[PDB]
Amino acid sequence: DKHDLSGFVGKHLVYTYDNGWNYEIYVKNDNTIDYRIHSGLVGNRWVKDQEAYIVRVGESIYKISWTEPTGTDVSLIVNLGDSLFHGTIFFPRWVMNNPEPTVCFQNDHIPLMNSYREAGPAYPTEVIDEFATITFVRDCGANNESVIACAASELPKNFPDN
Numbered sequence: 077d078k079h080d081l082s083g084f085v086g087k088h089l090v091y092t093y094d095n096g097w098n099y100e101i102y103v104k105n106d107n108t109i110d111y112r113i114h115s116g117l118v119g120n121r122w123v124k125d126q127e128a129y130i131v132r133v134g135e136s137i138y139k140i141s142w143t144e145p146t147g148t149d150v151s152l153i154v155n156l157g158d159s160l161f162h163g164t165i166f167f168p169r170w171v172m173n174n175p176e177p178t179v180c181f182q183n184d185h186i187p188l189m190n191s192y193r194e195a196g197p198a199y200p201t202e203v204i205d206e207f208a209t210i211t212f213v214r215d216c217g218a219n220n221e222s223v224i225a226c227a228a229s230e231l232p233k234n235f236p237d238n
């Protein structure tokens with residue numbers, strides 16, 4: 077059933093690019109995600125309650141797409157059976173030039189993200205398109221506000237840690 081998201085809602089995923097950076101998605105409900113970035117040019121950025129389009133595209137393969145207050149567009153694949161992540165990000169030009177102004181708990185700064193969005197140039201768009209490896213999966217249930225509740229910089233240096 078392509079409309080059944082039972083196997084996905086509640087998922088807490090750690091995925092890891094080939095350079096070793098860790099990323100997190102928590103699938104909060106059938107149209108909402110939390111995420112948390114650890115490393116890189118937008119390291120420590122995190123986000124709660126992102127409205128998203130979450131569909132099922134294979135037996136244990138899911139897709140999540142959304143648009144961000146910065147002007148960024150995201151479309152990702154979570155293939156749970158093959159432990160395979162794939163992400164496409166459509167970054168406005170301003171974000172490529174100054175990725176650090178998106179580094180915050182975005183929920184506290186949505187007007188600021190919109191202000192930056194309206195200003196620095198939207199174009200040309202940079203498409204970043206990249207596989208990662210799913211390195212850890214948990215189930216935390218739907219609507220669990222305790223899954224993603226701090227910046228990555230507040231987590232154990234040990235991370236991940238079950």
Ligand SMILES: COc1cc(/C=C/C(=O)O)ccc1O
Nearest residue numbers: 093094095113116118204206
């Ligand atoms: C090879 O470079 C990478 C670029 C990105 C895009 C990242 C982001 O927005 O955090 C993610 C992981 C990477 O390994």
